[PDB]
Design a protein around this ligand. Structure first.
Ligand SMILES: [Cu+2]
Ligand SMILES: [Cu+2]
Ligand SMILES: [Cu+2]
Ligand SMILES: [Cu+2]
Ligand SMILES: [Cu+2]
Ligand SMILES: [Cu+2]
Lengths: 333, 333, 333
């Protein structure tokens, strides 16, 4: 049966971008092949130079977004080069059995494996590393991403009518727990292993020290802001593998939102803010109507503005005064 | 086009009460005019006399509830008198563009401005002050409220049949982060500005010191309990601009609830408790069937009973023994 | 009217098991009689021997699951033996009036009472002890459970077609706040009353020290894992009386989920993880398709793997390679 299926290899792209794909499937089911290489690396997360030992899928935090269609077979080759120091694996929330694939994919430095699973349910899901006994440590070290299983007929609105996006972006949100000395200064370690005993004590406080998009404070800003034009329909996929978040587009809305990200359910309309539970991927669809800067934020504003969970959208086009206008510009009484 | 629209000025009321309005619109679209005056003021939040420098819209925490209909134009005159010390602005989640209006409404002490925006989506939304760089500080200092954009045909149930409330109350829930000395005693400051550096350190712990309804512990109790009669249909609007909450009416239910508060979506029925994400306004509809006291609470009971998130409803009428009765009153075995 | 109703006494069972009942009602409305005995007891919660003074309904944490049908009358006899030290009561979220029954059921050691209430709304609800002024203390000491009010025609899917479970399990999740000395070692007390003043300070930090299923770390594991076979439809009821949780079946899904647990609403399909707000009971329905171990967890992984919120499912049957298969077993590059 599988022997007879057509096969296509896909080369992944770095978040927030997403590899090429078709919204509506033009072919029948296939075996979609992906290759990921694990990379343990030092990463600076804030302006002051705080450094950590990140554990990554393909070298980025979050890992890249995989996109397939319902009933395709996902075939993943997972390599753990000998330059890494730790055993890793992968658990796909989109998969059925063997702990999401975690029990079948344990690779020490120097090994590789190939897992295949059928994508039976449509929606966006989280995938994350989950080695027995050190699960929260690898996940909160940035070792998680997401996979999108699109219905073979693409997205649909509250009424069964089609929704087609022009642009798609992947925002992976990450809670980091950096050990601190007695004064509150962050600690630095030589190897991931040296940080371990202190990492566990830091996590039990349950209070992240940083919460960031795309692996660092200010990663999606300035020359890195997300882009769009008035009139474009944009799909933003957002994932949180460990902790709850509440995304909000400042100056915009979520016209159609799947908060818990499962496409067999109808979307919720006109959301100002929506809750994505820890361990879940969500998707919101919005059509830009006004140009300018928009702040995309986790709406606990302390987590957004003090801890790092804020990104930007830079949108081009003409201003519409019917929708909003300054009748009287700020001036002295 | 707007030139030709009828205009009505509306005078706001202090929470938990709501200004007069029509559920079903009897007129066509209009320009609804409101005036708000910012007031920086000291406010005592608990029984022991803990005092803070509140930043308010119209002098209350939360700011007053504005009520309009879908497709009306909201025209707001925002004044920042010279007696205030800080720059403030306003971001409406109900609005499209310019950071919810935040980028068009920056007023230093002594200035005023007038913003107009079209209310294109029906539902209850949060509005809050959001000055660049000091956003969480103004929001958690009590500078937020909500606006309700009613469908021109009023509210509807899960089946498209009408829902008409007899009473409406606005409960604004607020998380406060009061600085403490080494022993845990709360600090006091001369001006809002003196508190700033300590305010930021207190917020980063992410642990509120107080969580209250209507600006103080016990604000909606005793002689201030909300009132109703068995048989009245009551709509309770609840908002949390920064942090998640889970309202629950002890001894009652949410017969129809819009947790994320957007009226184009059907309500959820028979809720015991519902989640309102930080940065959102929700509405629950309930018809009283039994008289007596009811406690309205944030269902994390530590936040409710130790931190201040508890209010009361005092309901009049006859007891119904079919629904509940004490078969055997407490007595010795 | 009630005089004329048939009556059936039901003997409760210890979680995670559930007393015998019919999904579809074969009789008309009845008065269902239950008896619960309160038991204050020492309980060891973790591997290192941490001990607390648990306050329980029937001697277990959580209290047992009661199962009735919509419009039945629940008649509860609640006994507080003279061996207990504290006053207790009971508030049913499924009930209408008198604070969920809390105001009618206050019993000091040595007393008993019998309350009757009509179960007018279908769904799973939380019940918990709630004495005036010491509410969070009794709830977080393990004094809560849940009651399931089934539609007289049983469960239904998104389309009105029937859903019948073969097995049902009740998982009660509990947040504990154990006082600690200056080094972080947990404290021990002689009586519940001795712990009180320290219990209140521990709760205000809002950071649980333990979060467990069925009253202890590892309670649902090993020889205590939940069991099923490939092909069985399993309903898992989960409750959290004080704090939010996000259940997730590792290697599985929630095929149909009522997150806020109210059966008049349609279920959400294909969930990877769902949010149950503090103060609520939820239910997820899943049909096993692969054999092996599954981890059932609260998806904040630090709460799951460091704090105790993890249980197991041991499932029998044949592996299906169409759904998942290891193409290349881990081996050296
Ligand atoms: Cu790993
Ligand atoms: Cu997971
Ligand atoms: Cu302000
Ligand atoms: Cu906002
Ligand atoms: Cu009790
Ligand atoms: Cu309760």
């Amino acid at each position: 049966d599988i022997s007879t299926l057509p096969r296509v290899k896909v080369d992944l792209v770095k978040p927030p971008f997403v590899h090429a794909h078709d919204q509506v499937a033009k072919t029948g089911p296939r075996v979609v092949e992906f290759t990921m290489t694990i990379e343990e690396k030092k990463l600076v997360i804030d302006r002051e130079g705080t450094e950590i030992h990140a554990m990554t899928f393909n070298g980025s935090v979050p890992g890249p977004l995989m996109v397939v269609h319902e009933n395709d077979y996902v075939e993943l080759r997972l390599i753990n080069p000998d330059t890494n120091t730790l055993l890793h694996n992968i658990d796909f929330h989109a998969a059925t059995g063997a702990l999401g694939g975690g029990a079948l994919t344990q690779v020490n430095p120097g090994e590789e494996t190939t897992l295949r699973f059928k994508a039976t349910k449509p929606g966006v899901f989280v995938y994350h590393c989950a080695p027995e006994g050190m699960v929260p440590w690898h996940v909160t070290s940035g070792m998680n991403g997401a996979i999108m299983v699109l219905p073979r007929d693409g997205l649909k609105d509250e009424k069964g009518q089609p929704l087609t996006y022009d642009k798609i972006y992947y925002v992976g949100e990450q809670d980091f727990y950096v050990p601190k000395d007695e004064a509150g200064n962050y600690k630095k370690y030589e190897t991931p292993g040296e940080a371990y005993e202190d990492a566990v004590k830091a996590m039990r406080t349950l209070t992240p020290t940083h919460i960031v998009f795309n692996g660092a404070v200010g990663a999606l800003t300035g020359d890195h802001a997300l882009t769009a034009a008035v009139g474009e329909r944009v799909l933003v996929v957002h994932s949180q593998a460990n902790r709850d978040t509440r995304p909000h587009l400042i100056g915009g809305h979520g016209d159609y939102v799947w908060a818990t990200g499962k496409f067999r359910n109808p979307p919720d309309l006109d959301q100002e803010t929506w809750l994505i539970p820890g361990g879940t991927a969500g998707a919101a669809f919005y059509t830009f109507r006004q140009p300018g800067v928009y702040a995309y934020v986790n709406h606990n504003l302390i987590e957004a503005f003090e801890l790092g969970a804020a990104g930007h959208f830079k949108v081009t086009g003409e201003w519409n005064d019917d929708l909003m206008t300054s009748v009287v510009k700020p001036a002295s009484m």
